[PDB]
Amino acid sequence: AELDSLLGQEKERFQVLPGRDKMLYVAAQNERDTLWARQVLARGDYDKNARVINENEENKRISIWLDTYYPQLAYYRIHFDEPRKPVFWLSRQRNTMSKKELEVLSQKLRALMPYADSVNITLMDDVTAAGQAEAGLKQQALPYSRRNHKGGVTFVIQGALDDVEILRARQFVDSYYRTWGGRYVQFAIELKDDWLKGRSFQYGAEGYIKMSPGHWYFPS
């Protein structure tokens, strides 16, 4: 009675991989599927050892290990489109390593992932990342401000946004985050009430708002 026979009728929903640790690994695509699988093991329908895994869990676990042994490494994300050969994206500018050091890193990652045969390390450009973010916000016609720091970029999107804007912003941010993660570029979205509706005012270098006749407000 193989494990694949126990997961259901839809076969291609899951992928079973043997590991050097003498344990079966079940690769899932999302939380719902993850729990659909975990139930089988927790019920005890299978007699040998098995484990369930997914991309978000593995990214978190590996980042927690990196925090301890490489506390200054600049990197983006690990992609598991092909689970036998993950791809690890590192910053070209912020890192400084030799080829030997990169190889050592590769081998230690391979020891953390007993289901993978090798890990490919690829160097990506930060300017590219930041540019794709800004281009996407322009494409969506959102209002924004950009702030630059030594190791990160922050985009502030705040005001009296409309429903359409909220929806399109949410969709875009969700798309970008899945590609680049949240380490280098951050988006801050904030709603605030419109002070200016229905009031006459001067705008320019010397703006002010008439709160009413006889009352001047000078923000600065």
């Binding site: 126990l6 259901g8 009728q9 839809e10 719902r32 729990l35 659909w36 139930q39 089988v40 927790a42 019920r43 005890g44 329908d45 429903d163 359409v164 929806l167 399109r168």
Partner: protein, 183 residues
């Protein structure tokens, strides 16, 4: 077999069954007539079934509508009760109309009850509306919010596009394959 719940309504029981099947728990529905429905599961699945029943706070409540608080069996109704019943009927008739639009599966609507004061000697306040709706997969949500706003705006004497909030979402993946039976 262990008893989870008894004396359920038809529309509670079907919701529990749906939630357990989603998590791969095979369940059974039994009818006792005047005693209602009973739900049962196997022992290996009992723990999980308990955890999910708690986490979703099942069985579900009856659904609440403002007109229940002001039953028309009255010797006298104040202005306040009549106006409340009125608005609580409009809310329901709007939801029932939105479900007829193309591709909408379900929706909910809310109206700002000014009726919590009579406007007694006071100028009237404008109306605000909120709506939630669920769409079929592959729908251009951005392009469909416009239709809803346009439709709601003219349903009332004075409404501004600024005062209408609309939130849309897509249906989740379909649960077609049956759960596995414990070995």
């Amino acid at each position: 077999d262990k008893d989870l719940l008894k004396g359920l309504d038809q529309e509670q029981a079907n919701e529990v069954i749906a939630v357990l099947q989603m998590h791969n728990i095979e369940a059974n529905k039994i009818d006792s007539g005047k005693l209602g429905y009973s739900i049962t599961v196997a022992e290996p699945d009992f723990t999980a079934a308990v955890y999910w029943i708690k986490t979703y706070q099942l069985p579900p409540r009856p659904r609440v509508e403002i007109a229940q608080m002001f039953p028309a069996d009255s010797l006298v109704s104040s202005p306040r009760a009549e106006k409340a019943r009125l608005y609580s009927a409009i809310e329901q008739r709007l939801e029932q109309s939105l479900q007829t639009m193309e591709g909408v599966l379900s929706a909910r609507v809310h109206i700002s009850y000014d009726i919590d004061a009579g406007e007694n000697g006071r100028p009237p306040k404008p109306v605000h509306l909120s709506a939630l709706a669920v769409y079929e997969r592959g729908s251009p949500l951005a392009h469909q919010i416009s239709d809803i706003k346009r439709f709601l705006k003219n349903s009332f004497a004075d409404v501004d596009y600024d005062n209408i909030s609309v939130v849309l979402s897509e249906r989740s993946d379909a649960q077609l394959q049956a759960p596995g039976t414990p070995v």
